[PDB]
Symmetry: D3
Subunit: 245 residues, 6 copies
């Protein structure tokens, strides 16, 4: 059995039904090495795939690249190969002043500012994580000693206008996203990232278990553009450990 | 002091920051009596308000009536009077064949088939419960010996076409909702009700903590038209409230 | 035989094909007693059901509760039991300075700021009353001697942000409804209520005859506070009108 | 003062506050001559404008052309020149089997299957006629001896796919409109035309009185090719009705 | 054999597979006379139809009237009569300060501020001209010595609020279009007209080749009242360009 | 002076380049760069591999976009901040018209916006349209390579599977919106599916940037035959040859 993009087979996964899915291909090996016997499987495009053992159980680590589209491909093809549980880890920008750099966020629900989520469920469907994964992620994050926030994540198909950044080439933002950061802020939204809406909606509507944990590397009340990453991947691995049956 | 609809003042609530919000006004006293010193506060329209004490702390029980609109009023006016945590309990129709009558469902997210939620946040915003409330509801429901399901709830502004019932006056359902139950079913949606989308969206976007627990009284794979489930449901929401009390 | 929510049967209605549908269950008896032989049928949730006779014909009075969702249930279940005509009565807040407290509004069309209407017809479908019912309601309202306004009603799924109220817990109104009050006022919208859009859309698309008449009890463009005698009279006149409107609808 | 398209001035209208607005420029003179002292004012593009007198009061007749866009231009520019009341008359195709060819329809609300209405009010706003105009049209229609239907009109930006016609170049209808006629039929929609949604929405949200009356030229459940003598009689009656409706509005 | 509105037959067209479609009925003759053996075919409503010969090949010239609805009818019925290629020429108002009065615009894509386009394809579908037609139009326009702009055209279902004109009867513009002018300007949109969105979307989704070329009559950042000689020269240049564009499209 | 956050390059790194060639695959970046003079690796972060090269004495950037509008929008934006004004998109595609063969080339004249990122630059009404000069240069270059070239509409999806109505998936389910969508696009004359054009074109057309998309057809959803290996390899090489030629035409 083969897949179009990931360059791996079901056999390469060694019966793994859980995958950790960072965005950056270069973080895949780093995640894999936190577990036992990390093995490089394949590397094509933004998709770097590693396999490792966690408490004697096979775990896949597969980068998604940036954004819902490349993420949806990874999730689908991993699903075709037996993966049922997806643990998202990444960096994020906080929009609440009380959420500090270094804090960890576990997404209880995503504002669907993406297009890919709509390819699995209409907008009315909630971009919500599997409750067990969100629970495992909260537990792993809190046990690590990190400061953890459970709440809503604004998930944008763009890094710049969709997160209302103005230090850009045009220096402007389409009507929809003008004043949007303050809007999300007033609505209690914790942070911005770019994959959770797609991942959560796709999985919640496909019989797949998913959750998102993110390390805050910037607070948007302070500035627009930028370890926390190291602690984040330790957390997602322990979250994976908690998810293992 | 005094809110437009609920007919109660902040002083009436005795410092209560948590509310249990059933739909049926007749359920209010039944919930209240499970706690200490229940007292009738006011009854206006579909809004019946009791105050009670749970482990020393004041707790409000307030009916919402059916639907997001009447619910949004209760939640807002209770919020004006200092309530920050809202525990929804009610009945629901399951759409998954493995979810049985008597089971309980704690909503982890609502399909927003309502209009009121849009008055607090755009459709992209997730109709999501507070995690502590959802966690407390699961624990409470499990401890009661009930079979508990965590998952997505379809929350409809109508009981009939929005939940794709056909045994109706017209026997007709608008295009949007034709085949919708099968669609939600394939998407793993657990059940139908009418208040969660509004409640969850409103609270999640207003700095209020909310969650929903529901006793399944009908499985929609079996039929369209629906008491031990009733009694167990309110005991759970009270225990969930106890877990939430700080 | 017995509808799930209203807890009544077709026999309970005594052949009634017309329902008067106030929002407040406590108003149901008051309306019923304006007619002959008022009889309490059932009371469940926000649904209080009476039956009465008007010119020898059975009329149902059934409360809807607040909002389109609970309203849609009452209308549907009454329709299952043979009711074909629905007369909405209540009180409302005017948003036009020329519309005074005590005046009455007959809705010719509703701004669909609700969600339940979408469960019967897509947004492009007009939330309009049956022409005969609107005609009857206008006639009854004018014959009562009150000043009557025929126009568009903003029908909101919320009492607060959807009607751009800022005196709230958050004090915040979502982008969609920011400045919406001014917008509706400029478009000539007469008033805000919370059931008409659902009711009118549901009925106009389901072969049911419906209309809405309301007594103006407050005006948000006027800082003046109406006296208790005016509010009481308005409340009484509104239900007097809807019963006379029913009388005109009877065949 | 001058306008951009109609080529008429306020002085040309001689104080007219009411306009009868047919779709076909050829129909303008036919309407005008039913009144006193018809005078050709201008003819630019689809806009043929006549002035006439009805019971001593100036009345403007102005064609709209086909569709909301050209209609919205006419209504706006007439409004700039002092016109406050607009009486739409036009041909239509019925979609209900109980509505016969030769019957008349007065629109109580329009299904907004257009785009121009959205330029005046969001979709939730009802495409509703002024109640006096609808009432005047119903009376004038009934008094002409015609069988009159009050109800919802589906108002489409296209003649073909938006009215679900398949006998076309591509024979294709976009997903949105596939099975739409059946849907409108089930929702009790009476007929198709192409201007009412824009007209009613624009006017209802701009402080203008508007209404639509139409002669049924074809029934979509029957045949597309109308019989000549029947068509002629219907069209003659429709313009007589709208003039009488204008008379009722001016009184 | 017979079309519903145009009043012409396939035989009338003499094997013409290309149509030049101006908006103004009066422009049809002007365009036809730029070609050989111009022949008046029919004139009904907005639809003035002429036939002519360009390099020995039949070309039909047909007015569309204002707006997508009347345009969609013309295109469809011409298509039924064998037309496969549609060349749009029309007047436009530019919104970019660098686009001068008298310049020419060839639409590379249209902002779909209309409703009729939605009757052929969902909003996500690009309102895009056929590449050959756009190429031919650009070449014709540039060869004429005109200053030519390739870019996006905002295509509105209204002349007034949809193009954010405030000098109107109400002086009001619905929320959607408030500040929309500035928005389109910042997005590099070149001009406003009222037919391209419908035309381009309809044709690109129906196997029909279409394109739009327009003479800039006014600039919205300047004045609304065009100078007569400048306008005349621009309009004359535009029709010469579209005919030469038609010549390039001839196979 | 600044180094853009994702691409990890500076304005000085680009050597005055105002045109960028933007493939999807990072591995293809060097392959494109070496078709020009003095290719130099600039940076590789995430799915973004950036090379600089020279075409007729003028600096040109080659930068991968990764898969999808979101990652593409980042690349385009940050290159734009560093002075890039013209973006030439090249990539593989799946044709959905029986008259389009594997090995043929498609130049997008407009994109069906089945994405989300495009909405972050312009409302849905706005056309996902290429710059006319870029589309013209791409057509000419494609023709000059001897390829069969198709000018037309491209469906640009945020997903490879349900948004392109693939049913051979984990769920085998396709959401209501996209059920029967393939046939709909086909009947509407849509030529192919890819996953970046709507975002790219909408973003650039509304931001004063020039952009165009050219694509090598590597598969046809209507043809049951398996694409020949030799044709596929030729198509890969031809597509990047064409885009460099298109760049040359755009430069001068
Ligand atoms: C810091 C930061 C990261 N991200 C996410 C998106 C990408 O997947 C990743 C790298 O930018 O981090 C944001 O969306 N917004 C931010 O402010
Ligand atoms: C049994 C059942 C209850 N409900 C909810 C709606 C009301 O709030 C309440 C009473 O009907 O229960 C549904 O929405 N669907 C159902 O099938
Ligand atoms: C005064 C007032 C009443 N109402 C309606 C809503 C309720 O159904 C009813 C009681 O508040 O009156 C409004 O919607 N807006 C108003 O301003
Ligand atoms: C007969 C008929 C007429 N019309 C309208 C549209 C035109 O404005 C006018 C002439 O066709 O009549 C329809 O829209 N649908 C129909 O079926
Ligand atoms: C001058 C001008 C013309 N037009 C078009 C619309 C009509 O089709 C035609 C005549 O006004 O020109 C606009 O849409 N906007 C403008 O500013
Ligand atoms: C063959 C094919 C490729 N693609 C694009 C998406 C990816 O960016 C790239 C590699 O799969 O090609 C499609 O979108 N659909 C298709 O059918
Ligand atoms: Cl990452
Ligand atoms: Cl920071
Ligand atoms: Cl309850
Ligand atoms: Cl049905
Ligand atoms: Cl059951
Ligand atoms: Cl009431
Ligand atoms: Cl007419
Ligand atoms: Cl013209
Ligand atoms: Cl590529
Ligand atoms: Mg700048
Ligand atoms: Mg029946
Ligand atoms: Na209610
Ligand atoms: Na027209
Ligand atoms: Na990517």
């Amino acid at each position: 059995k083969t897949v179009f993009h990931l360059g791996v087979t079901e056999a390469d996964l060694n019966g793994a039904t859980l995958a950790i899915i960072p965005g950056d291909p270069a973080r895949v090996q780093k995640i894999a090495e936190l577990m036992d016997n990390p093995v490089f499987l394949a590397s094509h495009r933004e998709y770097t795939v590693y396999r490792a053992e966690l408490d004697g159980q096979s775990v896949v680590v597969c980068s998604t690249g940036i954004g819902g589209p490349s993420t949806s491909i990874a999730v689908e093809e991993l699903a075709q190969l037996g993966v049922r549980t997806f643990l998202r880890v990444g960096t994020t920008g906080a929009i609440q002043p009380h959420v500090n750099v270094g804090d960890m966020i576990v997404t209880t629900g995503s504002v669907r500012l993406d297009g890919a989520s709509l390819h699995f469920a209409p907008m009315e469907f909630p971009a919500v994580p599997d409750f067990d994964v969100a629970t495992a992620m909260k537990a792993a994050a809190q046990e690590s000693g990190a400061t953890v926030h459970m709440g809503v994540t604004a998930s944008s198909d763009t890094f710049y206008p969709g997160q209302e950044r103005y230090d850009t080439f045009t220096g402007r933002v389409v009507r929809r996203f003008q004043g949007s950061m303050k809007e999300w802020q007033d609505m209690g939204v914790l942070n911005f990232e770019m994959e959770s809406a797609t991942l959560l909606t796709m999985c919640a509507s496909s019989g797949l278990k998913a959750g998102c944990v993110a390390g805050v590397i910037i607070n948007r009340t302070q500035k627009e553009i930028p370890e926390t990453e190291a602690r984040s991947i330790k957390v997602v691995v322990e979250a994976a450990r908690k998810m293992l049956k």
